[model samples]
Target: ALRGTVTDFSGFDGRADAEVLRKAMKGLGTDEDSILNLLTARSNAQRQQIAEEFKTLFGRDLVNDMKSELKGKFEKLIVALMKPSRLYDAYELKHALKGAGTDEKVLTEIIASRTPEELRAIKQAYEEEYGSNLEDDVVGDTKGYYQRMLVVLLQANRDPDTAIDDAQVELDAQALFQAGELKWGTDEEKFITILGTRSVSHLRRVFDKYMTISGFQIEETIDRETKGNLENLLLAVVKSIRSIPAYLAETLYYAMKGAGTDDHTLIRVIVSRSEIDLFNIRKEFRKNFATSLYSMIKGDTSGDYKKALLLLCGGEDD
Candidate 1:
C-alpha cells in the first residue's frame, strides 16, 4: 500500500550481487553476513535481477542452492526474497488453505488487503503454481456468510478508483447502524454490501460518521452484534480499509505475544510488508505495544533467523 524504507539501494549491480551470493554458497560453510548484506540491502526488483544473474553465471537456481545451504527461518526468508511479491503472496494464500482446518486469519489478511491488480496476479499465480483455482478452494474450505464475504473480496473489485460521496457515506453509516445495532436481527448482508463494494476512502468516512451518529465505534458495534468468523471477517475489512499497516502490526504482535511463536504469521507479515508499509508498521508497533518491533523480534528469535528478520525490519529500534 505504501513504499517502505528498504528500497533499491543505489549503485546496485546484479552481477556483483550474484557473484557475492555465489561465493557465499560455493564453499563448505556459508558466509551468512555476505548473504544477508547482499540480499537484504537490495530491493525486490534488484534481488530478482540478482537471482537471474546467479543462474546465468553459475548455471544453478539461486533459490534451490539457498534451500540446500540454509536452514530454518533464514532459508524461508531467502526463498521469500527470491520470489516476486505477488507470487510470494500467492504462495502464502495456497498454504493457508492447504491442510485440515483453514487459517482464517491468513485468508482474511491476504484476501481483504490486496489491491485489485495485486489480487488478480495472486489468483493467477495461485492457479499456475498449484494447478488449482483459488476461488474454488476458498469455496470448498469455507461456508455461509464467511464464504460469501470471501468470494466478494476475491473478485478483486473493491472500487479503488471511485469518487467518494458524502451523502452516500452518511446513508451507508446509517445502514450499518440499522443493520447491526439498531435492528432486532442483524442484517449482515447490508454490512457485507457496504464493506465489500464501497471504496475504502468512503468506508473510512462511513466509519467515522457511524461513531458520530451512534456514539460508539463501528468496530465496537461489530463485536457486540456479530459472532464467530463473520465478526472477525467484518472487523478485518474495516481495519484493512482504515489502516493496513496498523492492522498488520497488531497481527505481528499477536503472533509473537503468546506461549510460542506463530512462525507463519511472523514470516508472512515481515516478508509481505517488507517492501510495502513495513516502515510505518514498525512505528505503529512501537506506538501500540510500547515496545520496539526489533526488541520483540530479537527477544523471540535467535541466530541467523533473527538476523534475517532484523534486516527485513530495516534497522534496530530505538
Candidate 2:
C-alpha cells in the first residue's frame, strides 16, 4: 500500500543538475498526476525537501502552484504541509470567515481552549500575517463579556502553580455552589464566568479540590444541571483538568465514530491533535474501542481524507 506513496510522479530528487523540480513541474504544467500523487502523500520532512527543491529549481513557490491546482478541501490538505507558522496563519484564516457570518465556534473553540504557548504562537502569527493585533480583531468582531471572556482566554498566561490550598476546599465548594448549584437553578452564567477565567492548573487544583470536598465528580454535578454549549464548555474545562489527553481521546473517538462518523472531523482531529495529545488519545481510544484511532479513521474515511489523516500519524509506527 505504501508503494508509489513516495516519488510517484516525476523524478523529484533523482536528477542533480537539470533543475529537476522545474523540469518536472514545468513539463507537467503543475498538474502532474505522478508528482501531485506522491508529493501530496509525503510526510512533512519529505514535502519540505520537495518545497526547497521546487524553490531552488524553479525560482517559484511550489505552494502557490499547488493552491492554483487545488481548491477547498484538497487545497486545505495540501496547505497543511506548509511550515507550522504558515499553517497557523491558514487556520486563523479558516476561522476568519465574516463574509456571510463569523465562525465563532471555531474561534471560541481554538482560542479559548489552546495552551498558553499555542495561544501565544497563534497571536504572533495572526499579528504578523494580518498587520494588526488579535485582540483588536476579536474585540471588533465580538461584543460584551463574551468578547471579554475570549480575551481573557487569549491572555494565556496561566500561572502554573498547581498547588491547592487545603482551606480552598470550602472555597471551591462555595465556588461550585455559585457556579453549578446556586440559587433557583444552575448558575450557568457564573459557571461560564469562572470556568472561562481560571487558569488550567488552577482549574486542575480546583477539580481535585472539588472531588475531595464532594465525593462525586464535577462533571456529574454539571451534567445533572447545565445544558447547551455552556455544558460542553464546562465539561471541556473538566476534561482539561483531569488528563487533557484522556479528554482529547474521548473527544476524538466521538468525533470519528460518533453518530454519522464525520470524516472531516476524523481528518481534522488526527492532523491537528497529533501534535498535542494524539498519542495518549490513541491509547485511550484503543482501550475503549478495541481498535486503533488510525484503523478507526481508515475504516470510516477514505480518499484524500484518509490519506491526510494517516500521514499526520507519522511516528506511530515507532
Candidate 3:
C-alpha cells in the first residue's frame, strides 16, 4: 500500500516575487529536472501554493517562466500543472462546438474514456463552475442528428460495476429486434437507461449474456439499430464499456492519421491528459496501434510541437 504524503509550506518564510523566483530558478539553471520533480510530483493543491509563492518571491509567474524555459510536451505538462482550470476548459470548449469546425475528437476521447462516476463529477463541476449545465449547452449549441448524438453522451449515466442480467439480456434482445432489425424506436429509452445505469460487473455479465442470447456484442446491436450520430454515440458507449484503452488507441490513430493530422485535437488531448491518463495512453498506443507514441510524434509533427508531444510520450518523470 502507498503511504499518505503531505506537503507543508507553512514554515518556508520568504517572499514569492517574480524576480526573486526567477533569480532562484536561474541560480538553479537548467535544473528543470529538480524543479519538475519537486513541483509536479506534489498534489495539485500543493502546486497551487507554490505557484503563488513563486510569484510572491520572484515578481514573476512560475508558469510563465516555465513556459519560456521548457519546450515541447514538458512545457505543456508544466503549464497544465500550474492551471487546473485549463484541462476542464479545454473539454468545455470542445463540447461547446457547433456549425463548422466542430471538435468531435474532443467529445470522442473525453466521453468514451471517462467512467460514469468521472463523467458525473465533471458534469457537476462544470455546471457549478460555469453556472450552466453541459447537457443544456450541447442541446442549445447543436441541431439535427448531430444534436441527438451529443445528447446521448451528455446524458450518459452508466453505473459502474452494474452488470447485465437475464432480464436485461432479454430486454436488449427485444430492443435489438425492434429497433435494429425493424427500424423503430425499439424502446430505446429502456435500452439506453439500462446501459447508462448498469455497473461494470453487471455490464460484463450482460455483455456475455448478450453474446450468447443475440450472437452479437452491444456494439454490433447498436450498429444495426441506429444510424448517423446516434449510432456513433452508442458505439462510443459500448466501446468505452468493453475496453477504454482500445477505444483510445483508435482515437489516437484517427488523431494522427492523414497528411496534416488534426493538430488542434492532437495537441489538446496530449497536453490536457498528460498527468491523468497519459501513462496508460502510452501503453495503449504501443499495444493497439503497433507503434510507440514517441515515434508517431516524430513522424507527424515538427519543431516545438513535436518536442512537446515527445516529452509527453517519453514518461512523466522530470
Candidate 4:
C-alpha cells in the first residue's frame, strides 16, 4: 500500500512517446533509453497506452520491436515491464487454471492481492485473452468460504476510498471479532463480506480497533479460527491489504530462504514489482530478514538470471 519506486510521469503524451520510440528504433544504431529508461520511467498504464499507439501508428509489437534493438539481461527486465499489470495477472491465472489440477496458490495470490479496479481490469483481460469467463472457471474449481471470498474479490467491488469512519470502523471491528472471536463457532459469511468488501484504509483501521476488542492480531484470530485453503485466502487478504511490499518481501525472502532457491518465483516477483515497489520491498526485505535481496541473489544465482534480477533490484538496500 506504500508508494512505488517509479512515479507516474506528469507530462504524458502517448503519441509523442510512440513517435520517440519509433525514432529510437528505426535507425542503424538503436537508442537504449528509448527502449529501456522510457519504459521504466512510464507507469504500466502509460506504458500500455504507448504500446497501443506504437502498434496503430506503425502496426509493430513493441515487445517484438525490442528484440532486434536491445541485448543481454537488460532485455528481459525491460520486456517484462512491457506487459500491463492486468494482462500479466490474466496470464498467470490462465497458467494456473491449466494442467490436470488447478493451482489455488496462484489463484489466491493474484486474486487477493489486486485492487478492485485492478481486479476488474484483470477479469476483463481474462475474458478477452481466453474467450471465457474467469468467474465461471473459478467457481467450478473451488468451494465453501474460500470460493465465496474468491468470488467477492473477482467481483472487483471493494469499497475504494481512503477515508475511514470511526463508527463504521468499530462496527466492522466488532463484527470481525464477534464473527471469529466472540461467537459460538465462526460466522465465515460475516468474515467474507466484512474483509472482502471493505476499503484498504477502512480495513487497516478495522484491524487496529479489532485488536482492542479481541486483544489479538487479526491474523492470529484468523489462524486460530480457520484452517486449510480458506485460512490462507483470508490471510492473503489481510497481509496483502496491510502492506503489499512487506507481503512480497516475505515472498521474495522465502523463495531464496533455504537450501534451493525458487528461481521462478524470484524472477516473477522482481519483474512484476520492479516498477511498482521493488524498492520498498527491498527495504522491507532487509528490515525483516538477516541479509539483503541483492546478496541473496549474489549468493543464490549466477549469469543473466542473477544479472537481470539484481538489475531490477536497483542496487543494494543495505
Candidate 5:
C-alpha cells in the first residue's frame, strides 16, 4: 500500500487530541477548521485511537458529537477518516449494495482494485458489521454473468505473484480468442476464469498476446461479446490489470462529471485512494480529463466539504 500525506502525527497525544475535538464540537459554534485540521492531519489508525480515547475520557462518542455538530459532506469526510480502514471499506460496500439501484461502479472499483488480503479483510468486516455474507448479498442483488463474475472475485483467490508463465499466458490468450471471437456464442466462463484468476503482470501479457492473435484488442472483444454489467465488470478487470491508478482516475472523473456530483463516489475514491496511489491517480485524471481533480472539486463543491476533499487529495492542484 502507498502512503498518504496524512502521516501519523509525531507528537501524538491521543487524550489531548480527543479533548481538543470535544472542545471544538461542544462549544456554541462548531470549530470546523479545528476539526478538519486535527482529523485530516492524522492517519486513520491515529484517528481511531483518538476516538477511543475521546470516549474513555468524556464517556461520549466523538463520532456522535461530530454528527450532532456538523452536517453533510464535511461530517461524512470526518467520519470516514475516523473509521478503521477495513471498517470504512465494509461501510462503503454495504452502502453500495443497499437501497434501490445497485452502485455497480463502487462495487467494481472496490472488488477489482483491492489486493487479495485487503479484499479478505473487507469481506470479514462486511460479515461482522452486517451479519450476512457479502457474497450472498452480492449474489442476491446482481444477475446472470455479472453475478457469476463477481462471485469469483469475492472469493479473493487471485494469484498475486508476479511470476509470469509465458506459455500459459499464450494458452490463456488463445483460450480467450476461442471462447469469445472464434465461437458462435461466447464462453463467458473462460473469460471469467482467466481474467479473475491470473496475476496482473500475467494478465497484461495475456491481453497483449490476445490482441496479437485475434486482430482485436481484448476490450474490443469484450465490447462485441458482452453487454451490460458483465461488460463493465470484465472491462474493469482489464483496466485494473493494466493500471489500477488509471482505472481509479476514470472512476474519480466520472464521479464528478454531469449535472450533479456523485458525492459518495467522490468521497469514497478520494478517501480510499488517499494513501494508495492517489498522487498517480491525480496525474492520470489530469492526463485523461484535461483538468485537475482539485479544480474540478473546487468548481463543484463549496465550504468545508470541499476543503476536506482537497485535503484528502493532498492539497491544491499540482
Candidate 6:
C-alpha cells in the first residue's frame, strides 16, 4: 500500500553494487558522486544487503569505510541513509538527547509519527544502543505533562482498534470541550490520555466531533487551551491524525524556509521517507507549497549534497 519515490531496484546485485562502491572509494580521489548515485538508486532495504556483502567481501564495514572517507553534510546524509530504520531512529534520538540542550522537535517528530510497533522497536533499539530507558531519558529531559505524554507514547500502548464508535467520538470531544474551553483550568492530562493513547482512526473521529461542538477545529482549540512545548506536542499529534503527508510537507517547507535550511530535517525527511511514502510527500509538497520538491531542492541547495537529494527525490512530482 505504501509507495515511495525510491522503489525497489530490480535486477539488483548486492555483490556487484558492493564491488563498484568499494572501487569508488579506493581510487586516487573518492568518487563521491558514484557512491551517492549508487546508494540513492537502491532502496534502504537494498543498502543493507549491499553493505552486508560489502563487509563479507572486504572484511570491513562499509559504513565505517565511508565514514572515514566522507565529511560534512554529505557524510551525515550518507550515514543516515545507510542505517537500518530502527537503528537510525535510535541514533537520532540519542544525538538529540546527549547535547547540552534537548531537541524536543526531533523527539516529537520521530515519536509522535511512529506506530506502537515502531515505537516499541525504537525503544528496544534505544535501550540496547544507549543502555538507557527511553522513558527514563525523557523524564530527565522534560518536565510535567509534556513529559508524561511522551512517556505514554513510548509505552507503545496506543489503542489499536480501528472501528470507530460514534458515541465515544462525541463523548471524547465533549470531554475535550469541558476540559479545555468550558472550564477555567485546563485539564491537560485528559488531552494527554486521549491524544496520546487513542488509535489514529479514533483521533480522526474525535477531531471532527470536537470541531462540531466548538465551532473551531481541534488545532484551533489546542491553540486556545495550551501553550509552549505541550501545545506543539498536541498540535503534532493532531496534524498527524488529520494527514501525515501534509504534516510532513509542511515540515519540509519550513525546513527550507527562513534565512537558512534546516538541513537536519531536510535530510531526515528525504533520506528516511525516500523509500516509504515520499511519493505521497511529493504530491502533498506541490499541493501545499505550489512548487515541486525537486525545484525547491534545486534552487535552495548546491553541489553534491543537492545532487544526492534530487536523485533520492526520484523525479519532479509537479
Which stretches in model 2 have alpha-carbon errors above 4 Å? 1-50, 70-72, 83-90, 93-97, 143-146, 185-194, 197-199, 212-216, 258-264, 314-318
For candidate 5, the per-residue lDDT at 170 reads 86
Q: Which candidate leads in lDDT?
A: 6
What lDDT does each candidate get? Answer: 0.86, 0.60, 0.60, 0.81, 0.86, 0.87
lDDT tens per residue, model 5, 1-318: 444545678999999999899888785989999899788888788888999999999999888888989998888887787778768888988998999888888788789888788889999999989899999999888888898988899888998777788889989999999998999989999999889988878888888999899999999999999999899999998998888888888988888888788888888887877766788888877888889888988888889998877877754554
Q: Rank by TM-score, highest first.
A: 6, 5, 1, 4, 2, 3
lDDT of 1 by residue, 58-97 (tens): 8999888989999887888778877887688888888889
Each model's number of backbone clashes?
0, 2, 32, 0, 0, 0
150-258 per-residue lDDT for model 6 (tens digits): 8988898989887788989988999999999999979999999999988888988888888889999989989988988899888988887777788888889889977
Model 3 C-alpha RMSD to native = 5.5
The lDDT, on a scale of 0 to 1, for candidate 5 is: 0.86
Candidate 3, poorest ten consecutive residues by summed lDDT: 1-10
User: How well is each residue in 1-318 modelled by candidate 3, as lDDT tens digits?
Assistant: 211122334544334322344654694455555555455345456567667777666577778777777766556556655656434643445444645665554565576567665667777777776677777866776566556545665665555443346776566555545554455554566556556566656665666766776677767777766676556766766776776656665677787877777765666556555545666666767877678777777888875456545654564221
TM-score of 1: 0.93
Q: State every prediction's TM-score relative to the real structure.
A: 0.93, 0.75, 0.71, 0.77, 0.94, 0.95
lDDT of model 2 at position 190: 63
Per-residue lDDT tens digits for candidate 2, residues 65-179, read 7677555655665666454533554365446644656656556556644677777887777777767788787777776545666677678866555566656545756688656
**Best-first order by lDDT:** 6, 1, 5, 4, 3, 2
Give the Å error, residue 68, model 5. Answer: 0.8
- RMSD list, candidates in order: 1.9, 5.6, 5.5, 5.0, 1.8, 1.6
Best by TM-score: 6
Compute the lDDT for candidate 4. 0.81
